Amino acid sequence: SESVSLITKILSDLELNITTVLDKFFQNETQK
């Protein structure tokens, strides 16, 4: 339980948002 809580907290802190022809599909799908 302590291990799962600690690593869950680390992962949660790691997702908080911070304050040619191929280019068309790239910008539409991957870059977006």
Partner: protein
């Protein structure tokens, strides 16, 4: 008791079990077994 988190005080675990205890609607205590057991206990104490 129902997650992999950890608390800071065991008052919280006491309250967790308390909350899980009150999810069971009152009136289950109105079952025949509970009245039978309280009658049995009273009669046994009287016999003693």
């Amino acid at each position: 008791f129902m997650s992999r988190i950890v608390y800071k005080h065991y008052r919280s675990l006491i309250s967790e079990v308390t909350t899980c205890f009150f999810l069971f609607e009152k009136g289950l205590h109105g079952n025949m077994n509970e009245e039978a057991k309280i009658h049995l206990e009273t009669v046994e104490w009287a016999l003693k």
